[PDB]
Amino acid sequence: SNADDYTAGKEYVELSSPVPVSQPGKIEVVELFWYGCPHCYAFEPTIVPWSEKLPADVHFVRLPALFGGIWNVHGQMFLTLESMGVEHDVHNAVFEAIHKEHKKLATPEEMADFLAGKGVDKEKFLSTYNSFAIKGQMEKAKKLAMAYQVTGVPTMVVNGKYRFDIGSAGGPEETLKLADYLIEKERAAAKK
Numbered sequence: 001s002n003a004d005d006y007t008a009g010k011e012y013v014e015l016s017s018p019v020p021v022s023q024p025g026k027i028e029v030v031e032l033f034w035y036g037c038p039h040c041y042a043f044e045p046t047i048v049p050w051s052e053k054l055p056a057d058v059h060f061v062r063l064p065a066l067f068g069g070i071w072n073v074h075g076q077m078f079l080t081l082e083s084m085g086v087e088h089d090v091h092n093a094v095f096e097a098i099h100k101e102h103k104k105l106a107t108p109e110e111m112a113d114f115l116a117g118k119g120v121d122k123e124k125f126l127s128t129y130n131s132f133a134i135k136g137q138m139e140k141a142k143k144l145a146m147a148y149q150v151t152g153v154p155t156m157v158v159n160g161k162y163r164f165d166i167g168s169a170g171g172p173e174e175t176l177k178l179a180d181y182l183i184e185k186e187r188a189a190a191k192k
Contacts, residue, residue, distance in 0.1 A: 012164035019160035026059035033154040158182040
C-alpha cells in the first residue's frame with residue numbers, strides 16, 4: 001500500500017510528540033493488547049507470524065494495555081511470562097483459558113496454579129510476578145500507553161510516531177499492510 005491508500009488522522013494518527021523508541025537505530029513496532037480482549041486473541045495468529053518475519057532494521061515490542069482493574073492484573077501476568085522467557089504457546093494457553101474456558105485468572109495464585117499445568121514453573125512465576133522489578137515495568141508500560149495516547153486494543157504503534165488499530169485500518173490483514181507502509185515510510189525518510 002501507499003499514501004494514496006490512507007488519510008493521515010483516519011487509518012492512523014501521527015503523534016505530535018513522538019515517543020522515544022526502545023531500540024535506537026531501528027524502526028520500532030509496538031503491539032499493545034489485553035489477554036481478555038476478544039479481538040486481541042483473534043489477531044494473535046495474524047500478528048505473531050508477521051512479527052517473526054520482520055527485517056533487521058525493525059524492532060518489535062509488545063506491551064500490556066494497563067487500562068485498569070483486571071486489565072492490570074492480566075497485564076502483570078503478561079510481563080511476568082515475558083520476563084520468564086516462556087514460549088509463545090503459553091500465551092495461547094492464557095488466551096484460551098480466558099476466552100474458551102472462561103477462567104478469570106484474577107490473582108497470581110490462580111495464575112500460577114493454572115500455568116503450572118501449562119509448563120510454567122509456579123515458584124519462578126510467583127517470584128517474578130511479585131517482584132519490585134515488575135512494579136517498575138508496570139509503571140513504565142502505563143506511561144508508554146499514555147504517551148501513545150492509546151484508547152483501545154489491539155493497537156499498533158510504529159516508531160513511537162504512528163498509532164493505528166484493526167478498526168482504523170479496516171481489518172487484520174489491512175493492519176499489517178498499514179504497518180508495512182508506515183515502516184517503509186520511516187525507513188525511506190532515514191535514507192534521504
